Write a protein that binds this ligand. Structure first.
Ligand code: AMP
Ligand code: MG
Ligand code: MG
Ligand code: MG
Ligand code: MG
Ligand code: MG
Ligand code: MG
Ligand code: MG
Ligand code: MG
Ligand code: MG
Ligand code: MG
Ligand code: MG
Ligand code: MG
Ligand code: MG
Ligand code: MG
Ligand code: MG
Lengths: 52, 95, 107, 95, 325
RNA sequence: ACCUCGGAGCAGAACCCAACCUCCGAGCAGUACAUGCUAAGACUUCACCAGUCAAAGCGAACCUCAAUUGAUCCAAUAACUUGACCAACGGAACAAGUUACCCUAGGGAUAACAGCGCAAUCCUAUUCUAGAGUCCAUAUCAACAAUAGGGUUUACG
RNA sequence: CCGAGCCUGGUGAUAGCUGGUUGUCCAAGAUAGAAUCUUAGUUCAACUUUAAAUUUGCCCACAGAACCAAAUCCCCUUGUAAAUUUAACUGUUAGUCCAAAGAGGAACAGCUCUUUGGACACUAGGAAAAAACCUUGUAGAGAGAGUAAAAAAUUUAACA
RNA sequence: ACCCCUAUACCUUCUGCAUAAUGAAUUAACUAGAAAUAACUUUGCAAGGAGAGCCAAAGCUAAGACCCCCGAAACCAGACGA
């Protein structure tokens, strides 16, 4: 049902975080905080990392 | 733990302990929390935080560790800028 | 078959009249056997804790639920026209005063 | 606490044309409310015809009679069977 | 062991035989009100408060109201802001005095100034400190105004046909507490004018120490039946001006009753320094505000499951110490 | 048959408390993406390991849910991170039968015989008067039941 | 003495298993739980011993400890004297009956399983003999004294 | 001297043994706690100690004081035997 996915920030590169999403649906894009940049920034899904 | 070695006839260190722990000169034993680089997704942030801290070992545990190592690991070591240097000696104790 | 779960060790950790420092947990429970009162907080377990240095006291205080929390409101509505619910509350009554003005210098 | 004199202070469980017809029904309901009688339910039953109901329970003969009189004092009625006239209405009782 | 209740239990009378006959508070507001009422009531079970805590006139009024309604005719309502000044004036005339008591109680003037015992300030006192040409900064009861604005003595009115106007700081600065510092003392005044009445102690500005908090000065006004003597030159010595109003009231003000009050808040400012230096002739005291230190439990020999931060909590201080090498 | 986790009773009023005791369930979902950093002070499943709560501060706005999980070393990863119904669930990196052809160390801490306790079952005697006995409860049988006693049985311990 | 010979060597093989552990005298001294290829063992905890440092420790009295019995917790006074911490350890971690509240089983067991409290595994007197019921504990000598627990009771069917 | 009264050998193993649980005919001689880290103790010296190296935010050097015996079936190497 749910996939684990890694999400890569465009600005503040190097910072990746792991999240859930349903396997059936769209590649995920999300606003989230980069502590490197110290601002909210768009992350994009890249590579699933185990499924469950 | 080899109380007398075959050739030198000295005690040996269990090197597992050396790999895993840091003996402060005061004889506290510092350890990385277990389960700290594992299944971090399912873990709540607070739990993660908890798991990323170092911890001091129990008295009994400390004693065990002392027994498990030789007097070399208990010496005073004057490192240039070890981040733990300030914790070796102890300040303002009272029983 | 079935489960054999360990004892949960919940209940009061600090009783009325005990000196309780800010942060001390006062009572742990599932559901509200006690409620947070003056200077007493609630964790995600419903566990009650002291928000200031002081003395614990217990009191039976009239209970009004939050308007937004529906089930309680409904219950209240259901009650007859001279009824009041009542519930037990845990307070810390603070001891040491937050402030004391000291003389720095004569300028 | 059980043994304390403030035992069950928290205890709470023990305490706990069509348009015209509609208007008439509403009025009846209001009257019932005023006079302190249990209005259980009301229905929206199906040229055209339209029915409305006001289910009532528990009322003494004299009081009941009074109520009936007030209702009487347009369209129609139907509950002893007590019909009358000036779409449709049917105040079913349960005395 | 089942003990009976000491007094009557709550929820006893209302349960009754049947539940379906009663009215029930279908709303929340009613319930809330009930709760409030209950709270207000005392009870026997400790509880919160233990541990912490003409006809003609009426007719005339009615007539006026009717007239107003007629004038409106209502349409306006179907958005009229109303004149506020007039309302204020009315309040002053009538229930202003009543109101004033509450404020006084809140501010602890009756407990500190008069040692207990409340009284209504009937006669409305109207003071204002002049700031340039206009506007005159009015000393409404409770207001914050700076000691720069209070450098020179104010203008006073009250519309009353003898009086004794007084002004005192309630905190008791510098020296030990249960003391007060008077700022002036006007005496044996005929009518509305200050210049006509005598003055024993002349005006100082407020002189609140830096970071000492906020102080509460108080103007006092009494009714004179009999003219009386009082007691000291244009002085800036502090040991003379230290006096408490309670004792004064007791041992002297016997043919006298207070009728007018206004209290006034004060903070630090640049004039305070001047006051300290020029006329008082001393170094101004600086007041910080020190909180009590952080707690921490006793120093444990083997901390066990605390982080490496355990040792940073018990240390004097920060810099790296080198024992003997 | 079960072996890990949780809720209710036993366990009626601070915790704690067993059994191959009685009963429900879990090994997930949903909403977010500041489920950001850190940090006083506590609780803790009777050890340890694991868990829990958390004021202030700095950053920002203007979590729900009972259980819903798994160590170390190793792997896989530029790194962040991710790896088991390791379900015998504190996990040995990977292991099956059979032995009257058997052996050794032990054990009355655990059976078969025997004893012993108990007496469910069993055997007997009273009480009771339903009913059979052409009628008639007691010549003779005897239901429902009750009160005692025995230690033939098969069990149980 | 063939399910795989015999001898020597590795070999003082290895045993969570059994048996055995030798001068005197004194003192303190008993079985909450954990996990565990683990319940014949172990390692933590608990209890126990010693040497320290200390300030409180036990008894506790009003207040107080939800809703859906017995009692307990907390607890100032008070009677007392110790308890907490630090430094070293070993050993117990296969228990029994009695009273009480329960559970399984037969409302069986000298049956099985929890909890509270006794006792026993440590002398004595009693209850016939007796582990666990009752009286009783700090020691030695006396050809002195007062006590404690402490010895089962019954006997019975007329009737007009 | 018996006769009177009191008196359930010992060790081990046990929840519990006079037990009808083990062992022991008796004498003789032989026959079983051995190791340092870390503690404590008393000396020595002491911001140093130690007969190099090692340790040292009162240490260091010194001694003293703790840690059994008997027993398989077995496995393997090399000889010797029809
Ligand atoms: N899913 C897993 N997660 C973590 N470690 C694993 C996993 N599977 C195998 N291992 C490790 O891999 C090692 C080698 O086993 P494999 O089956 O070859 C084991 O010792 C385990 O520790
Ligand atoms: Mg614990
Ligand atoms: Mg915060
Ligand atoms: Mg055969
Ligand atoms: Mg064959
Ligand atoms: Mg054999
Ligand atoms: Mg047996
Ligand atoms: Mg036996
Ligand atoms: Mg018959
Ligand atoms: Mg051997
Ligand atoms: Mg002794
Ligand atoms: Mg038994
Ligand atoms: Mg048994
Ligand atoms: Mg034997
Ligand atoms: Mg082998
Ligand atoms: Mg031949």
């Amino acid at each position: 049902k749910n996939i684990l996915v890694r999400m890569v920030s465009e600005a503040g590169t190097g910072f990746c975080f792991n999240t859930k999403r349903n396997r059936l649906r769209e590649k995920l894009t999300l606003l989230h905080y980069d502590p490197v940049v110290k601002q909210r920034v768009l992350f994009v899904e890249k590579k699933k990392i185990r499924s469950l | 733990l080899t109380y007398f070695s075959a050739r030198k006839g000295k005690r040996k260190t269990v090197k597992a302990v050396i790999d895993r722990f840091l003996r402060l000169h005061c004889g506290l034993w510092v350890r990385r929390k277990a389960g700290y680089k594992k299944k971090l997704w399912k873990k709540t942030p607070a739990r993660k935080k908890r798991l990323r801290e170092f911890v001091f070992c129990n008295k009994t545990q400390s004693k065990l560790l002392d027994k498990m190592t030789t007097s070399f690991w208990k010496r005073r070591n004057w490192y240039v800028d070890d981040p733990y240097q300030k914790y070796h000696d102890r300040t303002n104790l009272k029983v | 078959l079935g489960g054999k779960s360990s004892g949960r060790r919940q209940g009061i950790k600090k009783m009325e009249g005990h000196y309780v420092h800010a942060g001390n947990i006062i009572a742990t429970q599932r559901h509200f056997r006690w409620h947070p009162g003056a200077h007493v907080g609630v964790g995600k377990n419903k566990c009650l804790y002291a928000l200031e240095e002081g003395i614990v006291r217990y009191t039976k205080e009239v209970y009004v639920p939050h308007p937004r929390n529906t089930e309680a409101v409904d219950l209240i509505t259901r009650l007859p026209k001279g009824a009041v619910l009542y519930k037990t509350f845990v307070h810390v009554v603070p001891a040491k005063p937050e402030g004391t003005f000291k003389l720095v210098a004569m300028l | 606490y059980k043994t304390k004199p403030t035992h069950g202070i928290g205890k709470y469980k023990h305490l706990i044309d069509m348009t015209l017809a509609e208007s008439y029904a509403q009025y009846v309901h209001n009257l019932c409310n005023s006079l302190s009688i249990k209005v259980e339910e009301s229905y929206a039953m199906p040229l055209t015809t339209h029915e409305r109901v006001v289910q009532i329970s528990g009322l003494s003969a004299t009081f009941a009679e009074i109520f009936l009189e007030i209702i009487q004092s347009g369209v129609r009625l139907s509950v002893x069977x007590x019909x009358x006239x000036x779409x449709x209405x049917x105040x079913x009782x349960x005395x | 062991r089942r003990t009976p209740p000491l007094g009557p239990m709550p929820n006893s009378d209302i349960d009754l035989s049947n539940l379906e006959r009663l009215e029930k508070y279908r709303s929340f507001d009613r319930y809330r009100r009930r709760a409030e009422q209950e709270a207000q009531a005392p009870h026997w079970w400790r509880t919160y408060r233990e541990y912490f805590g003409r006809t003609q006139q009426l007719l005339e009024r009615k007539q006026a109201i009717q007239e107003l309604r007629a004038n409106v005719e209502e349409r306006a309502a179907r958005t009229a802001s109303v004149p506020l000044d007039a309302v204020r004036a009315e309040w002053e005339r009538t229930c202003g005095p009543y109101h004033k008591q509450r404020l006084a109680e809140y501010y602890g003037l009756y407990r500190d100034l008069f040692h207990g015992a409340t009284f209504v300030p009937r006669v409305p006192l109207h003071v204002a400190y002049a700031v340039g040409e206009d506007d005159l900064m009015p000393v409404y009861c409770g207001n914050e105004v700076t000691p720069t604005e209070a450098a020179q003595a104010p203008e006073v009115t009250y519309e009353a046909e003898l009086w004794t106007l007084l002004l005192t700081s309630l905190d008791g600065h510098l020296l030990e507490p249960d003391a007060e510092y008077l700022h002036w003392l006007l005496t044996n005044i005929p009518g509305n004018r200050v210049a006509e009445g005598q003055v024993t102690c002349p005006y100082l500005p407020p002189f609140p120490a830096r970071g000492s908090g906020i102080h509460r000065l108080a103007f006092l006004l009494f009714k004179q039946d009999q003219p009386i003597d009082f007691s000291p030159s244009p002085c800036y010595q502090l040991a003379q001006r230290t006096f408490r109003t309670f004792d004064f009231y007791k041992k002297h003000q016997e043919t006298m009753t207070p009728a007018g009050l206004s209290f006034f808040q004060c903070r630090w400012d640049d004039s305070v320094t001047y006051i300290f230096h020029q006329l008082l002739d001393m170094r101004e005291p600086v007041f910080e505000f020190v909180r009590p230190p952080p707690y921490h439990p006793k120093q444990k020999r083997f901390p066990h499951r605390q982080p490496l931060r355990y040792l940073d909590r018990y240390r004097d201080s920060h810099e790296p110490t080198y024992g003997i090498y």
